[PDB]
């Protein structure tokens, strides 16, 4: 048992632990036993749920897209027709997860993905199709499919998972960053140029996912909604950071919208009100 | 008293100057186990490990603060700047010494804080980027009290130019310069990066922010300003990949 | 009280690692050192 | 090299314009448009060309197409003007 | 050989030899090795011509 | 074969390149017993100890020769030049590599000679001085076949620009580049001076002269020229007294 | 860190074999031998 | 110097002839552990292990190259050819010696390369096959500079007659004949096949390609051609299944 508080009686100390200098930038560990007479209590607590592995470590929906299974004859832009959809993987699009991750500067983790496909048939349909989804992980910078039945889907190298709509797929992706950790913040440019983009960098490329319904068309249209869930595991985090206070406006940037509302709540009363 | 002598430079302080070493980690040379670049690194002598004094800022009653980015602020400082421009890769720690003296009648409190990867926000919103010239200002740094510029960062000190609240900036290595207590702040910064060494030109490892928290209140009839002076010494600096001098904008 | 067999060859496939025992906040709360005891290398 | 279409456009206040970003690189990793305007990436197949509907243009803006392609200029600015 | 200057590297001294009080009327013997990093040199010099007998 | 690798530079020679070490003395750092300046010297890394190639001269049938002065010729060469300008004092040895290749049909003989304290004569007589701009030409050096200039040195190679006869220049450390035998010459120069260290700007320690002795005779119908290339590497270089960058004329 | 039980009697049924430890490119990069040291059988 | 004496044959080379042994594997007789055919193999004497010289090709400024297929090229060579025709099965290594001498004024570079299973492409496209007569030309081999024939292989040396680029042919065992450096190339080929022994008639184990990479540039006024001569010696040759002499087309 780890002691939380030690028994401590009256103190006529000349080594005043309660007078310090915050000018130094140190949080001296002053305990209750230093300013009040205390009893001896035990922790009964390990702090398992505050470990970064747990704090940043449950599955969160990080992308949602709808794709369709329909007659593809006579369509030029299959992407526009929502026959397939791709998505550059990023954990920045959902703000809860982004703020949690942005509590740190550098983060290293392996990715466990869960893809949930759910079918809907809004228009008249005689039955529910037994559709199969192909979720193709394309490595960073690899060509995405350009049409629904492109040969890119038959890639001999791109990892692909085939699963029924209504069911899930699960697969882990190791940490794929070039550097020893992802740069959740980058104060630099890709090169010394006057006009080049700031912050957003290729260091944090985690890949991309393409989705299509493998089935040929039925007589009716089926709408499939794909939810990608990411779970970070084997998490390592460095350099704690000031938490995000203002809304986000874009991925990879710290920008916040103009004319934002005040973060700090105003007091109902003066500074003396409880 | 205290005295720090680096090369041909010396800073004496009649205050018992206690130094903050960011994350209790001293600057160190890149060890073999962490190294990726194969070239033998250039470890300069006294020529670079020395105190460079930047031009002083004036702290007025209504000044918001100042921000310097390293190693950008030292890009024009003697031999260090030249080496930073002639080499492809570089890593360095820093000993930052912020100086601001007043009388026992003045009041005010500066927050001196070092932010690794202080990615600045653009004041325009959306996904606009802060241009190179604004994030690499040099020894003048960024004055948070000036007006916005096209392609410049946002300059509301309450939000740290990044969308986080000022009160929370104490999570980073910092020291206060409380005019009643102390006149100098010393922070020793190690090399912080996801990569063992990096390009010194296109990437700023850390940002030094000096922010008035408690405003300057000078005694009656006194001049309503104080100078703030920043002195920096590169520590455990390494350079690799010497070649033709880099060309950067401004 | 608990058992795990590794079913896959990759370290990325293993379940979460658990808790980092040796947690010490002095890195962040007590980063002050006297520079007159020559702690610098 | 990175390219933007149109090079220049005059449009009514508050209107929408379609801006195209393109690269010479067949497989760029970063490709987008930097602008404070509300934008919408048009569903289009391929990696090296993107189209954005920049909506509700209120002032003179200079949206910049950006990329990580190292051939030529990796950024291209277009000039939007408003008439009212 | 009499040493003129001793090798001296970086110094984070708390016994600041360069801050003194001339109010006391003493010329404390502060050396170059106290304010700058120095190399080791030798005098090669006895001061025979500054002796009062010669002066 | 032979290969000399200094820093990130390498010179390969398929000739059994035998090096002349002036006066059988290798370049060395200033020992304590000889030192007068008290400051700890700056001993640069790979950054300066490397081969710098000067722009090539064309050896024609009627060319008189060329003269470079060190360290002047390297004053604009990467990190070495910068250090030479930022420091008050400096001493350095040199590895000079003169290269001139031809075919087995060419004939001609270059005298590559290193002259310590090669004080040049003025072509005007009396007590006129050779102006700074002419004795510090830089990487281009002095071309002995050009015409005289106001304040320039005399350029009659027979008299070595100093009133001594050319035939006698073999008393100095030298090598011949005999086109039938060898295409490269290598001379290792130690620091030579009456003072242990000196100002690198106002004083040229040595002069490198490349003089055609046996004229270039190219085969019939051949182009009547050969390029001569000089490659120099500073060796055991030290700098002392870092300060603001010196301002020299031209 | 890892476990495999063979569930089938055939070697063709086993999962992939893994990595060939002893990799040496001299077969392809240094195939030159002096023929005057009689290396030929 | 070097001398290789096989049987009653000898090749002398005043060049320090370094031999490439394909994949660092010497030719060897089929071991028992690898053998499938049960018949005791016929291992000929001096009668076959000897240098056979093929008719010489002329290397002109515009020649594309030549290709021989083994053992086809030796099917008419003394006792080896007879044994190859009288036996059902055969395996053999080879010592290939390509010879091309010139003066110190010539320039040009031959790529001598051995390709196992050099399946030739047809110039007609689709799924057309290269006919037996073209893939078994004999000691004359295939001249890549000649015109296409009905049923013949494609003859664009850039694509190696198989749809792969010429630059990449260095992955196979090869030697260059650089006229400035060497005049001979020696490659020792072991038996390479998915089967321990095979029919020597219907299958060509390897292909020898001699390709001009750097074109022949003869000195002014010189005859614009050089002869290229190929000399081959079977090594560790085995035959099995003697019977009536095979009948092949042409």
PDB file of N, CA and C in Angstrom, chain C:
ATOM      1  N   UNK C   1      -3.846 -14.756 -12.753  1.00  0.00           N
ATOM      2  CA  UNK C   1      -5.137 -14.090 -12.887  1.00  0.00           C
ATOM      3  C   UNK C   1      -5.430 -13.675 -14.326  1.00  0.00           C
ATOM      4  N   UNK C   2      -4.466 -13.856 -15.224  1.00  0.00           N
ATOM      5  CA  UNK C   2      -4.602 -13.317 -16.569  1.00  0.00           C
ATOM      6  C   UNK C   2      -3.564 -13.941 -17.491  1.00  0.00           C
ATOM      7  N   UNK C   3      -3.953 -14.106 -18.755  1.00  0.00           N
ATOM      8  CA  UNK C   3      -3.210 -14.893 -19.730  1.00  0.00           C
ATOM      9  C   UNK C   3      -3.304 -14.245 -21.102  1.00  0.00           C
ATOM     10  N   UNK C   4      -2.178 -14.205 -21.815  1.00  0.00           N
ATOM     11  CA  UNK C   4      -2.164 -13.753 -23.202  1.00  0.00           C
ATOM     12  C   UNK C   4      -1.188 -14.600 -24.002  1.00  0.00           C
ATOM     13  N   UNK C   5      -1.665 -15.136 -25.119  1.00  0.00           N
ATOM     14  CA  UNK C   5      -0.839 -15.796 -26.117  1.00  0.00           C
ATOM     15  C   UNK C   5      -0.783 -14.876 -27.327  1.00  0.00           C
ATOM     16  N   UNK C   6       0.400 -14.701 -27.900  1.00  0.00           N
ATOM     17  CA  UNK C   6       0.524 -13.885 -29.103  1.00  0.00           C
ATOM     18  C   UNK C   6       0.162 -14.725 -30.318  1.00  0.00           C
ATOM     19  N   UNK C   7      -0.890 -14.337 -31.026  1.00  0.00           N
ATOM     20  CA  UNK C   7      -1.364 -15.130 -32.147  1.00  0.00           C
ATOM     21  C   UNK C   7      -0.786 -14.668 -33.470  1.00  0.00           C
ATOM     22  N   UNK C   8      -0.139 -13.513 -33.496  1.00  0.00           N
ATOM     23  CA  UNK C   8       0.367 -12.920 -34.718  1.00  0.00           C
ATOM     24  C   UNK C   8       1.835 -12.580 -34.544  1.00  0.00           C
ATOM     25  N   UNK C   9       2.542 -12.523 -35.665  1.00  0.00           N
ATOM     26  CA  UNK C   9       3.989 -12.395 -35.639  1.00  0.00           C
ATOM     27  C   UNK C   9       4.428 -10.958 -35.404  1.00  0.00           C
ATOM     28  N   UNK C  10       3.544  -9.999 -35.644  1.00  0.00           N
ATOM     29  CA  UNK C  10       3.864  -8.582 -35.587  1.00  0.00           C
ATOM     30  C   UNK C  10       3.592  -8.001 -34.210  1.00  0.00           C
ATOM     31  N   UNK C  11       4.491  -7.119 -33.772  1.00  0.00           N
ATOM     32  CA  UNK C  11       4.298  -6.436 -32.500  1.00  0.00           C
ATOM     33  C   UNK C  11       3.109  -5.491 -32.563  1.00  0.00           C
ATOM     34  N   UNK C  12       2.784  -4.982 -33.752  1.00  0.00           N
ATOM     35  CA  UNK C  12       1.669  -4.057 -33.895  1.00  0.00           C
ATOM     36  C   UNK C  12       0.333  -4.749 -33.672  1.00  0.00           C
ATOM     37  N   UNK C  13       0.306  -6.077 -33.702  1.00  0.00           N
ATOM     38  CA  UNK C  13      -0.926  -6.836 -33.577  1.00  0.00           C
ATOM     39  C   UNK C  13      -1.291  -7.098 -32.128  1.00  0.00           C
ATOM     40  N   UNK C  14      -0.328  -6.999 -31.220  1.00  0.00           N
ATOM     41  CA  UNK C  14      -0.577  -7.266 -29.815  1.00  0.00           C
ATOM     42  C   UNK C  14      -1.554  -6.241 -29.244  1.00  0.00           C
ATOM     43  N   UNK C  15      -2.281  -6.649 -28.209  1.00  0.00           N
ATOM     44  CA  UNK C  15      -3.174  -5.737 -27.513  1.00  0.00           C
ATOM     45  C   UNK C  15      -2.366  -4.642 -26.809  1.00  0.00           C
ATOM     46  N   UNK C  16      -3.079  -3.683 -26.223  1.00  0.00           N
ATOM     47  CA  UNK C  16      -2.429  -2.557 -25.565  1.00  0.00           C
ATOM     48  C   UNK C  16      -1.454  -3.034 -24.492  1.00  0.00           C
ATOM     49  N   UNK C  17      -0.451  -2.198 -24.218  1.00  0.00           N
ATOM     50  CA  UNK C  17       0.677  -2.604 -23.387  1.00  0.00           C
ATOM     51  C   UNK C  17       0.368  -2.547 -21.898  1.00  0.00           C
ATOM     52  N   UNK C  18      -0.557  -1.693 -21.487  1.00  0.00           N
ATOM     53  CA  UNK C  18      -0.858  -1.549 -20.079  1.00  0.00           C
ATOM     54  C   UNK C  18      -0.280  -0.284 -19.480  1.00  0.00           C
ATOM     55  N   UNK C  19       0.130  -0.346 -18.216  1.00  0.00           N
ATOM     56  CA  UNK C  19       0.546   0.834 -17.473  1.00  0.00           C
ATOM     57  C   UNK C  19       2.062   0.981 -17.376  1.00  0.00           C
ATOM     58  N   UNK C  20       2.543   2.185 -17.671  1.00  0.00           N
ATOM     59  CA  UNK C  20       3.919   2.612 -17.410  1.00  0.00           C
ATOM     60  C   UNK C  20       4.187   2.805 -15.924  1.00  0.00           C
ATOM     61  N   UNK C  21       4.836   1.806 -15.321  1.00  0.00           N
ATOM     62  CA  UNK C  21       5.016   1.761 -13.874  1.00  0.00           C
ATOM     63  C   UNK C  21       5.694   3.046 -13.416  1.00  0.00           C
ATOM     64  N   UNK C  22       6.908   3.287 -13.897  1.00  0.00           N
ATOM     65  CA  UNK C  22       7.816   4.258 -13.296  1.00  0.00           C
ATOM     66  C   UNK C  22       7.427   5.701 -13.608  1.00  0.00           C
ATOM     67  N   UNK C  23       6.298   6.187 -13.090  1.00  0.00           N
ATOM     68  CA  UNK C  23       5.833   7.527 -13.440  1.00  0.00           C
ATOM     69  C   UNK C  23       6.332   8.523 -12.402  1.00  0.00           C
ATOM     70  N   UNK C  24       6.945   9.603 -12.878  1.00  0.00           N
ATOM     71  CA  UNK C  24       7.646  10.569 -12.041  1.00  0.00           C
ATOM     72  C   UNK C  24       7.466  11.962 -12.634  1.00  0.00           C
ATOM     73  N   UNK C  25       6.752  12.873 -11.966  1.00  0.00           N
ATOM     74  CA  UNK C  25       6.469  14.180 -12.569  1.00  0.00           C
ATOM     75  C   UNK C  25       7.568  15.213 -12.400  1.00  0.00           C
ATOM     76  N   UNK C  26       8.661  14.887 -11.712  1.00  0.00           N
ATOM     77  CA  UNK C  26       9.694  15.882 -11.463  1.00  0.00           C
ATOM     78  C   UNK C  26      10.289  16.416 -12.760  1.00  0.00           C
ATOM     79  N   UNK C  27      10.237  15.647 -13.845  1.00  0.00           N
ATOM     80  CA  UNK C  27      10.654  16.166 -15.170  1.00  0.00           C
ATOM     81  C   UNK C  27       9.962  17.505 -15.389  1.00  0.00           C
ATOM     82  N   UNK C  28       8.663  17.634 -15.065  1.00  0.00           N
ATOM     83  CA  UNK C  28       7.853  18.792 -15.411  1.00  0.00           C
ATOM     84  C   UNK C  28       7.671  19.741 -14.239  1.00  0.00           C
ATOM     85  N   UNK C  29       7.647  19.223 -13.014  1.00  0.00           N
ATOM     86  CA  UNK C  29       7.332  20.028 -11.840  1.00  0.00           C
ATOM     87  C   UNK C  29       8.584  20.584 -11.181  1.00  0.00           C
ATOM     88  N   UNK C  30       9.708  19.884 -11.289  1.00  0.00           N
ATOM     89  CA  UNK C  30      10.963  20.292 -10.660  1.00  0.00           C
ATOM     90  C   UNK C  30      12.086  20.279 -11.690  1.00  0.00           C
ATOM     91  N   UNK C  31      11.963  21.055 -12.764  1.00  0.00           N
ATOM     92  CA  UNK C  31      13.037  21.117 -13.762  1.00  0.00           C
ATOM     93  C   UNK C  31      14.138  22.114 -13.437  1.00  0.00           C
ATOM     94  N   UNK C  32      14.176  22.630 -12.218  1.00  0.00           N
ATOM     95  CA  UNK C  32      15.139  23.650 -11.829  1.00  0.00           C
ATOM     96  C   UNK C  32      16.395  22.967 -11.319  1.00  0.00           C
ATOM     97  N   UNK C  33      17.542  23.416 -11.809  1.00  0.00           N
ATOM     98  CA  UNK C  33      18.830  22.959 -11.325  1.00  0.00           C
ATOM     99  C   UNK C  33      19.721  24.174 -11.150  1.00  0.00           C
ATOM    100  N   UNK C  34      20.527  24.185 -10.095  1.00  0.00           N
ATOM    101  CA  UNK C  34      21.548  25.215 -10.004  1.00  0.00           C
ATOM    102  C   UNK C  34      22.597  24.959 -11.073  1.00  0.00           C
ATOM    103  N   UNK C  35      22.819  25.987 -11.906  1.00  0.00           N
ATOM    104  CA  UNK C  35      23.893  25.964 -12.940  1.00  0.00           C
ATOM    105  C   UNK C  35      25.408  26.207 -12.472  1.00  0.00           C
ATOM    106  N   UNK C  36      25.519  26.579 -11.179  1.00  0.00           N
ATOM    107  CA  UNK C  36      26.813  26.673 -10.424  1.00  0.00           C
ATOM    108  C   UNK C  36      27.359  25.424  -9.771  1.00  0.00           C
ATOM    109  N   UNK C  37      26.642  24.306  -9.896  1.00  0.00           N
ATOM    110  CA  UNK C  37      27.153  22.974  -9.538  1.00  0.00           C
ATOM    111  C   UNK C  37      27.595  22.347 -10.866  1.00  0.00           C
ATOM    112  N   UNK C  38      27.799  23.112 -11.979  1.00  0.00           N
ATOM    113  CA  UNK C  38      28.313  22.492 -13.224  1.00  0.00           C
ATOM    114  C   UNK C  38      27.598  21.194 -13.566  1.00  0.00           C
ATOM    115  N   UNK C  39      26.239  21.140 -13.644  1.00  0.00           N
ATOM    116  CA  UNK C  39      25.537  19.967 -14.126  1.00  0.00           C
ATOM    117  C   UNK C  39      25.586  19.836 -15.631  1.00  0.00           C
ATOM    118  N   UNK C  40      25.870  20.938 -16.322  1.00  0.00           N
ATOM    119  CA  UNK C  40      25.945  20.937 -17.773  1.00  0.00           C
ATOM    120  C   UNK C  40      27.134  20.102 -18.243  1.00  0.00           C
ATOM    121  N   UNK C  41      27.001  19.373 -19.362  1.00  0.00           N
ATOM    122  CA  UNK C  41      28.136  18.621 -19.908  1.00  0.00           C
ATOM    123  C   UNK C  41      29.192  19.530 -20.536  1.00  0.00           C
TER     124      UNK C  41
END
